[PDB]
């Protein structure tokens, strides 16, 4: 409703490096709020796509981002007659960006890793693996759980159980307000898809350089199943965290899983060590429901809600047609221990191929009544196909129906404006919460700021 | 914490078995490698080998092909180390090991086991 | 297998002192040495991995250093506590190999 579309701040990258497909708001040890952006397509020293990560202080004009620096060099380590190889080509750091208290997770889903042995192979494979800093202090670490040493051969006698070598860890992230990460990967199991949770402190005390292969005792993984419905379910393409159990001491996961059984699609909400609670089924096969979910309280009631988004469901339509526009779906958590019910809001998108649902922002209370409220993007909606972002308002029965206010995008054809998004968070210190909003087709990212209702 | 009780002092005759075993403590063993390692005030340390609790797969020295055995049962979370037909010369103190962060490494040790083979 | 040419077999020294313990192999091993203590009649403890990083717990005043094939274990200001027995631990390759041993002792 009031955030400003006519004043914008503009930050940008490099040209091609996909500036602005990842995003989120970091704050310092002196809560001075800047903008984590990962560019997962930036240039490294061999002129070699390997992604990077950019760290850009508030200016109200914007403008170019320091870099957030990392190690980009392949490491090799010859340890216990093996041979330990890394390679950071493609790896596309930056995909996913995520912050908490003065610290930046910056994750690689497409790390390749492989071991070798003699004229045996684990096999190149892309493991995944997050980057770590504390930009103040310049602390740096590393987390791969999906690294393995075990080789090619012992795999195919075991019918590639416990099989981690193409997780692709990083893939979607999240952080606990206690401090624990959580890593998705899509492609653990042999692409039925793996949870990594290991608390932060943990992740920087237990990391050396050079080390490659370590343990991190407090780290805890999802579990291997022999059930088809989960085979190539890709379990983990995105990640959220919330209370839903009514135990506020316990921490509850959302997890996305966009072709659960045989391309239905799915979203689970478990507890800490990934016992399901309960299972959202998909609407329509093939419509990715689970693409992108969101936790935030709508209906102000304190218990926090459920926003799952399906970019290509596609809706009924005269003379039997369908038509692909996207659908974001509502829940409302009932009061105490009972299961989430029917969606209790259906939203659905009106461009075709707009995606509608792609990405879902909580942007807290926006025009400060009480009820917080949410942003959806169709990177390729609006009347020019140029992308749209929707912002729905809470109210004390759930969502309204239709949007308070649309941004369209300021960006040329093919910008995936809204692709990510990232709010809830007061940039300029005017009271009100911002948004941000990435354009990695155009490397850049527009800010809009919230002001006073009108 | 880490901890790894051993077993007591085995006291046996040549030509017998003696099966020492590993407890965990304040960790599951199936976490990391557990090594074996002999040490003689002669020879020193020698390494005997190592098993990944969570497969059961084994790696030893050749010098100990035979003799030792090297086991691991998840459930009572220990780690067993088995000599057959011993020998004066197997008459050594007996430490299993585990990494702490590394790997490849070799951290924590047990207080050791004491065995004296003689008739 | 590796030889680990540990030395030397003994010294003697005093409260205070900076010392060196050096340890040599027959090969490359790129780091990936460990550095361990045995108190007398007691078990062993970890002092460094990979060569130069502490285990957790270990005082600042140890350090390793080294590359290739000839690193060092270095103590300064030597307390009470370490006249001790010390080993090195190759695991560059399977079978891990030690050092001969090098004992601490207080000269007098």
């Known amino acids: 409703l009031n955030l400003d579309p006519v004043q914008l701040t503009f930050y940008a990258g490099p040209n091609g490096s996909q500036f602005g497909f990842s995003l989120d708001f970091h704050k310092d040890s002196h809560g001075r709020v800047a903008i984590v952006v990962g560019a997962p397509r930036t240039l490294g020293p061999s002129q070699e796509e390997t992604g990077g990560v950019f760290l850009c202080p508030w200016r109200a004009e914007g403008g170019q981002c320091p870099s957030l620096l990392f190690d980009l060099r392949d490491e090799t380590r010859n340890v216990g007659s093996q041979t330990l190889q890394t390679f950071k080509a493609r790896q596309g750091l930056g995909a996913s960006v995520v912050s908490w208290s003065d610290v930046i997770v910056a994750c690689a889903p497409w790390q390749h890793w492989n071991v070798l042995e003699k004229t045996e192979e684990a096999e190149k494979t892309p493991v995944g693996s997050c980057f770590l800093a504390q930009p103040e202090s310049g602390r740096r670490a590393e987390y791969s759980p999906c690294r393995g040493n075990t080789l090619s051969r012992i795999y195919v006698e075991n019918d590639f159980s416990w099989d981690k070598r193409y997780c692709e860890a990083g893939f979607s992230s999240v952080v606990t307000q206690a401090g624990e990460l959580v890593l998705g990967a899509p492609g653990g199991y042999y692409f039925l898809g793996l949870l990594a949770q290991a608390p932060v402190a943990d992740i920087f005390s237990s990391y050396r350089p050079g080390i490659l292969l370590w343990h991190v005792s407090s780290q805890s993984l999802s579990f291997d199943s022999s059930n088809p419905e989960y085979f190539d379910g890709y379990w983990g393409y995105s990640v959220a965290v919330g209370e839903f159990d009514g135990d506020l001491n316990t921490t509850e996961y959302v997890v996305g899983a966009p072709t659960w059984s045989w391309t239905l699609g799915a979203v689970e909400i478990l507890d800490s060590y990934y016992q399901r609670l309960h299972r959202l089924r998909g609407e329509q096969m093939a419509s990715y429901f689970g693409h992108s979910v969101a936790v935030t309280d709508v209906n102000g009631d304190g218990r926090h809600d459920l926003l799952v988004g399906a970019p290509l469901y596609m809706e009924s339509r005269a003379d039997r047609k369908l038509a692909e526009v996207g659908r974001v779906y509502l829940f409302l958590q009932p009061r105490g221990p009972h299961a989430l019910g029917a969606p209790s809001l259906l939203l659905t998108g009106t461009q075709l191929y707009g995606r509608f649902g792609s990405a879902i922002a909580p942007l807290g209370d926006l025009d400060r009544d009480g009820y917080n409220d949410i942003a959806v993007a169709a990177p390729y909606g609006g009347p020019s196909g140029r992308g749209q972002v929707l912002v729905f308002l809470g109210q004390s029965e759930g969502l309204r129906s239709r949007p308070s206010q649309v941004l369209d995008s300021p960006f040329p054809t093919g910008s995936a404006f809204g692709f990510s998004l990232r709010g809830a968070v007061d940039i300029d210190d005017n009271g009100y919460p911002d948004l941000i909003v990435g354009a990695y087709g155009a490397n850049q990212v527009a800010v809009y700021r919230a002001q006073p209702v009108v | 914490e880490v901890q790894l009780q051993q077993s007591g002092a085995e006291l046996v005759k040549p030509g017998a078995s003696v099966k020492l075993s590993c407890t965990a403590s304040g960790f599951n063993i199936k976490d990391t490698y557990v090594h074996w390692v002999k040490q003689r005030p002669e020879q020193g340390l020698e390494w005997i080998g190592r098993?990944?609790?969570?497969?059961?797969?084994?790696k030893y020295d050749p010098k100990f092909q035979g003799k030792a055995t090297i086991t691991a049962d998840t459930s009572s979370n220990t780690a067993y180390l088995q000599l057959s037909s011993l020998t004066s010369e197997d008459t050594a103190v007996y430490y299993c090991?585990?990494?702490?962060?590394?790997?490849?490494?070799?951290?924590?040790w047990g207080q050791g086991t004491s065995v004296t083979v003689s008739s | 297998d590796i030889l680990m040419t540990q030395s030397p077999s003994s010294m003697s020294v005093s409260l205070g002192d900076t010392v060196s313990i050096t340890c040599h192999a027959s090969?490359?091993?790129?780091?990936?040495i460990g550095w361990l203590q045995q108190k007398p009649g007691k078990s062993f403890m970890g002092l460094i991995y990979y060569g130069t990083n502490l285990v957790d717990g270990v005082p600042s005043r140890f350090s390793g250093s080294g590359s290739g094939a000839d690193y060092s274990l270095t103590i300064s200001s030597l307390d009470s506590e370490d006249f001790a027995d010390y080993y090195c631990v190759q695991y560059a390759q399977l079978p891990y190999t030690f050092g001969g041993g090098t004992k601490l002792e207080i000269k007098r």
């Open positions: 090991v585990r990494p702490l962060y590394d790997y490849y490494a070799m951290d924590y």
């Open positions: 098993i990944d609790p969570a497969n059961g797969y084994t």
């Open positions: 090969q490359g091993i790129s780091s990936n």
